[model samples]
Target: GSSGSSGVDEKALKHITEMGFSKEASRQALMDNGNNLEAALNVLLTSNKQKPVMGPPSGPSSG
Candidate 1:
């Protein structure tokens, strides 16, 4: 039984995934931002800054 518990926007999730974000992360971001791509992106970007290894390599950083 496939359950649609997240109810996140497919297009938005796809876009986020294309940007190298994990499916789980993208879906959660979309969920937190009301499925708004822009808002979700902002959250992801900000969050990634703190945890760079979570998503794709965003480039060199001072550890």
Candidate 2:
């Protein structure tokens, strides 16, 4: 067990963030996967697939 930090590799965080993942989620995945980059990536991708898509605002915008 380490200190306060998530203990995930910094380079791994940067790599995943550069690929369009949020810092919080990336760090969470990395930490959850025990710092295993591949498994962390799978965690992210799987979660992404399960989430619903959000696009432009629906029927009401203008007044």
Candidate 3:
């Protein structure tokens, strides 16, 4: 696989660092998830995994 640096990722680094995560740590996490935060944190751990985050379950399929 190619291991070249990602220009798009570097571009987003400053903002993510300002949000609290160290530059290197944030960069790695972003790369791990292809730059998607929701997937990176595994947002499903919250209501997102099995149901809506704020609202109640919509149906049996949602469970």
Q: Among these predicted structures, which one has the highest lDDT? A: 1
Quote the positional error of residue 18 for candidate 1 in Å: 0.5
Error (Å) of candidate 3 at residue 61 is: 18
Of candidate 2, the 10-residue stretch with the lowest lDDT total is 1-10
lDDT of 3 by residue, 1-63 (tens): 137876227555565666555666666666776876544334223323354355865676844
Question: Candidate 2 overall Cα lDDT vs. reference?
Answer: 0.78
Model 3: lowest-lDDT 10 consecutive positions: 40-49
Reference-based lDDT, residue 44, model 2 = 86
CA lDDT of each candidate? 0.81, 0.78, 0.54
Worst window of 10 by summed lDDT in candidate 1: 50-59
Error of 2 at 23 (Å): 0.5
Candidate 3 residues lying further than 4 Å off, grouped into runs, are 1-8, 37-63
Instruction: Return the TM-score for candidate 2, rounded to 2 decimals.
Output: 0.64
Per-model TM-score on C-alpha atoms: 0.66, 0.64, 0.43
List clashing residue pairs in candidate 2: none
| Native-to-model Cα distance after best TM-score fit, residue 14 in candidate 2, in Å | 0.8
**Poorly placed runs, candidate 2 (over 4 Å):** 1-4, 50-63
